[PDB]
Amino acid sequence: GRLIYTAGGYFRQSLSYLEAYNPSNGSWLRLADLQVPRSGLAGCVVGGLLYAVGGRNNSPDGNTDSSALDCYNPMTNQWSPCASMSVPRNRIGVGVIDGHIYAVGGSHGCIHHSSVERYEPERDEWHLVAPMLTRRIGVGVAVLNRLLYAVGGFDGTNRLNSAECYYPERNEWRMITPMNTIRSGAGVCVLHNCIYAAGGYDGQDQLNSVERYDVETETWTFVAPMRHHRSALGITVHQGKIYVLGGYDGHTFLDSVECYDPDSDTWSEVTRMTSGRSGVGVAVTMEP
Amino acid sequence: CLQLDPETGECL
Ligand SMILES: *CCc1cc(CC*)nc(N(C)CC(=O)OCC)n1
């Protein structure tokens, strides 16, 4: 069976929690902690292994941005360090294409990156690829049809409604149609033939709106809004439904987990996280 | 408050 893993996050300080939710029975399991606490990281899976990429440890003793890549194996319940990226990347976005991890954007102190690098698990090596056309932190990343999309974020001065796509065989980024809403800290995922952008912050308020990009029509369309406004949420897809986890709503660190059913265009509350937090990394893999 | 990042909630 497959579980939704949530790694890290923030509540009072950056966290080292690894917890896994089972949609089939509503259970939560607490698994091995990350070796270093981190929030603003991203999670992904390659070959049944869970990876935690980038982030920052915002601790009582200071703020340290992370260039780390760590790998969790559900068969052993152990984390192992991998090669680190070229630079630290807080509020990074990641996508997997053909067994390789692409790390996009993020910040290191006041530096807002446009750089992008790609990890090859078989060689344990990272290499830089073409940078994005825009610097983006708090960027949402998703993969559809072996193309990588970077959506929204913050460029160091303005929050963005823009988005762009990377075409690996041409090592080139191109702008796509911008979203109808400015969003930094949105959750971005893919479902069917669309890229969804949920929540985030528009410069004034945390959002409950959700829009999707149809890659054939090049248009963005709003779908049903989430019940809760949220920014710095985790997101993933499991058995044809989108799950959003936690986040910050300007008042509370949410423990709410909502699930979108695209056939009925409705969101429902399915479980609560064990404690409220923002800036988690999320991905789906086998039970431990 | 404006000591928090409004996107993430983190203390600045
Ligand atoms: C408005 C509540 C709040 C939150 C935080 C966390 C950054 N700080 C503060 N201040 C003003 C006290 C302080 O010393 O902040 C630095 C950690 N208030």
Numbering used by the authors:
A (entry chain A): 325 to 612
B (entry chain D): 2, 4 to 14
Quote from the publication:
The transcription factor Nuclear Factor Erythroid-2-related factor (Nrf2) protects the cells against oxidative stress by regulating the transcription of more than 200 genes containing the antioxidant response element (ARE). Nrf2 interacts with Keap1 via two conserved motifs in the Nrf2-ECH homology domain 2 (Neh2), namely DLG and ETGE. Unlike the DLG, the ETGE motif binds strongly to Keap1 (KD ∼ 5 nM) through H-bonds, electrostatic and van der Waals interactions.
In particular, our peptides aim to retain the beta-turn conformation and featured the E78P mutation which has been reported to improve the binding affinity. To avoid the additional negative charge brought by the carboxylic acid on staple D, we changed the residue to an ethyl ester to yield P3-F, which displayed similar activity displaying a KD of 12 ± 1 nM and an enzymatic IC50 of 2 ± 1.3 nM. An X-ray crystal structure of P3-F bound to Keap1 Kelch domain could be obtained and allowed to investigate its binding mode. The binding mode was found to maintain the hotspot interactions of the ETFG motif of the native epitope. The structure revealed that the peptide retains the hotspot of the native epitope whilst the staple and functionality sit outside the binding site.
